[PDB]
């Protein structure tokens, strides 16, 4: 199955985000950090190891997808390259984001970050950096990601995902 | 409540399987306790009944559980088992000895082995009787002690074979096979070789040679 | 003699300060009334200096020094890596009536006749074990007290645990002594080595599993892949059991299998490899791999069959 | 699968000889073997615990408890 | 060099002993089996002749 951006009608004051990665503990911590605060909207977080998802009918529509990659592991990079082939091209227009973990400790790194830079540039999407094991750093990334989610869902007038594409575009 | 019925069925099945596995079918059980404390001393009085294949039993005992800070010692102070009045006097005297010794496990083990050998003796007698109706006179019965082998045409010559089950003082069970010869003198003065006076030892060697039923079959074929 | 004095001083110097009194009490060679004369508040060096003088004033042989060594050894018993032996007997042989004195005499005589100079000690341990310390020598050399051999023999059983220090030279001789003294025909060495003698004991006697069945949150987060997680948890629980795992620290595998993956298809010879696993608590790190996502739900049987097979070193062929 | 009978009792011989056929006789044989051992050990331990006065030295004994030797002096 | 010879001859004797132990036993019941069999045959023949 191929995931589609506008398959279902939106809910009332609701935003949904999907996190795809191999490390489950990091995903759980990130979801908790996102949900701890209070906001005007209603938030829902879905956790998955890879795509395609198991089939279900009650799934609400997905507004934003974040691919988190561990720089200390080749397995995570291979998993994300495999997952990237099951989402339709229409869904990359301002609704996909890449998150890279572990650049703080360079000695542990198995992946040269030229690789993730080139991957993000190839798929026309932003690339973010955060060390998710540190709670203080994770807290601010959760809020930035919540704001991006609110923009994508249509909860800020005058700004849409396609507009967000030009704001976050890199010069080279 | 259907699930509760499911647990009832499961427990009944488990009880039946265990009872047929061990061979002891246990009936109702009653426990009455009295606390006699000075280090705590507690006494219990038990009562249970049951049966094992043919044999049936009901027994009553009591144990004194001398609880303390570092050991939980329980001794069967008083035992009492009562038997249905059969003619098996040896089982009764074993009952008396076990009652004096006040041991419960040994009683059950010996009862199992005894009834087990009894079942072998009865089934062997029944099978060999139904095999040869014409050369076996079961005078007292298949569930009894001895056997009679004789010819229908002439009752003068007959040998009797005795099968007995004995319970030793220590508790273990072991059988024994002997025979006696009801022979008229005329046969004695008839033949000169006269090896029938050695019949006990030779018969025991024969039965130990190749089995019990084989020796009896050979003897009954030879007599015929 | 100065040699026995040096031996005792070295053995005492090995002992930690806080537990020196318990060792001295168990050894009880020195009289009790002599002990309170010495003060243990002062420096370790002063205490050992005084203890040497007290044990020298009384007559001290080499046998009591060896006994002190055995007593010190059975307290630590993780300073050496142990190995296991197994003895077998004939089918018609009857059960023997073990006698300690006869065992001591036979194990004495075999060594005494094969070599010439050799010191062997005994310390009859509680819970049905025997500790033996052997100092090796030959016709033309005196025994070497620096490199002894310890063996723990459990009477009435086919198993004996030995320490691998210098036994390589005289392995068949000790095998013969053990198999003769205990009335066994054959002996073989189990390929299972460890530094935890108690874990080895629990595995060898297979008594590490002692459980017998008798009758006498933030709902906003949605976890997909939940069925896979529950399935891997169930498989891990089934495969690794629910008992506390015995503590090992090492495992070795030798591989002689063919490469099967375009790449080396024409090659007909095996690919030669040797791999080792090391951990402070092995079999506990392995249990946690699959839930963490580093391994598949069922691990290969080579990893989950250590205690059941009583095996530590493996060899695999195609 | 697993058990708690001690090692020096011969379970392997009984298991090999009676396990595949007539399972209940196997169980009863194991019961006999265990009861005898427990009784012998109890006798030895109770003698040691109670009558330390008469015995001169500790008695000699082995794990399976089938060979006892002691020297006793009565007053 | 001589020590190794001692060890290996000891292994030889230790391995040889069980075989003799088993063989002697086997002969022991074999002979008694033959004798008892002959005795039983004689006794059965005599008793059958007497009854006939």
Short mmCIF file of N, CA and C in Angstrom, two decimals, chain E residues 3-29:
data_model
loop_
_atom_site.label_atom_id
_atom_site.label_comp_id
_atom_site.label_asym_id
_atom_site.label_seq_id
_atom_site.Cartn_x
_atom_site.Cartn_y
_atom_site.Cartn_z
N UNK E 3 58.92 -43.13 32.08
CA UNK E 3 57.68 -42.73 32.75
C UNK E 3 56.47 -42.89 31.83
N UNK E 4 56.62 -42.50 30.56
CA UNK E 4 55.53 -42.63 29.61
C UNK E 4 55.16 -44.08 29.38
N UNK E 5 56.17 -44.96 29.32
CA UNK E 5 55.89 -46.39 29.18
C UNK E 5 55.08 -46.90 30.36
N UNK E 6 55.45 -46.48 31.58
CA UNK E 6 54.67 -46.87 32.75
C UNK E 6 53.22 -46.42 32.63
N UNK E 7 53.02 -45.16 32.23
CA UNK E 7 51.66 -44.63 32.14
C UNK E 7 50.84 -45.42 31.12
N UNK E 8 51.42 -45.68 29.95
CA UNK E 8 50.65 -46.34 28.90
C UNK E 8 50.38 -47.81 29.22
N UNK E 9 51.31 -48.50 29.88
CA UNK E 9 51.02 -49.88 30.27
C UNK E 9 49.94 -49.91 31.35
N UNK E 10 49.92 -48.89 32.23
CA UNK E 10 48.84 -48.81 33.20
C UNK E 10 47.50 -48.62 32.51
N UNK E 11 47.44 -47.75 31.49
CA UNK E 11 46.21 -47.62 30.71
C UNK E 11 45.82 -48.95 30.09
N UNK E 12 46.79 -49.69 29.56
CA UNK E 12 46.51 -50.99 28.96
C UNK E 12 45.82 -51.91 29.96
N UNK E 13 46.40 -52.06 31.14
CA UNK E 13 45.82 -52.96 32.14
C UNK E 13 44.43 -52.50 32.56
N UNK E 14 44.27 -51.19 32.75
CA UNK E 14 43.00 -50.64 33.20
C UNK E 14 41.90 -50.89 32.18
N UNK E 15 42.25 -50.85 30.89
CA UNK E 15 41.25 -51.15 29.87
C UNK E 15 40.99 -52.65 29.76
N UNK E 16 42.01 -53.48 29.98
CA UNK E 16 41.84 -54.92 29.80
C UNK E 16 40.97 -55.54 30.89
N UNK E 17 41.05 -55.04 32.12
CA UNK E 17 40.34 -55.69 33.23
C UNK E 17 38.84 -55.90 32.98
N UNK E 18 38.06 -54.90 32.54
CA UNK E 18 36.60 -55.13 32.39
C UNK E 18 36.25 -56.26 31.45
N UNK E 19 37.03 -56.48 30.40
CA UNK E 19 36.69 -57.50 29.42
C UNK E 19 36.74 -58.90 30.04
N UNK E 20 37.81 -59.19 30.77
CA UNK E 20 37.89 -60.46 31.49
C UNK E 20 36.76 -60.57 32.51
N UNK E 21 36.50 -59.48 33.23
CA UNK E 21 35.43 -59.51 34.23
C UNK E 21 34.10 -59.89 33.59
N UNK E 22 33.79 -59.32 32.43
CA UNK E 22 32.53 -59.63 31.75
C UNK E 22 32.51 -61.06 31.23
N UNK E 23 33.61 -61.51 30.63
CA UNK E 23 33.63 -62.82 29.98
C UNK E 23 33.44 -63.94 31.00
N UNK E 24 34.12 -63.83 32.14
CA UNK E 24 34.01 -64.85 33.17
C UNK E 24 32.56 -64.98 33.63
N UNK E 25 31.93 -63.83 33.90
CA UNK E 25 30.53 -63.83 34.28
C UNK E 25 29.68 -64.54 33.24
N UNK E 26 29.82 -64.14 31.97
CA UNK E 26 28.98 -64.73 30.92
C UNK E 26 29.09 -66.25 30.90
N UNK E 27 30.32 -66.77 30.93
CA UNK E 27 30.51 -68.21 31.00
C UNK E 27 29.79 -68.80 32.21
N UNK E 28 29.81 -68.07 33.33
CA UNK E 28 29.21 -68.58 34.55
C UNK E 28 27.72 -68.85 34.43
N UNK E 29 26.94 -67.97 33.79
CA UNK E 29 25.53 -68.32 33.65
C UNK E 29 25.31 -69.27 32.48
#
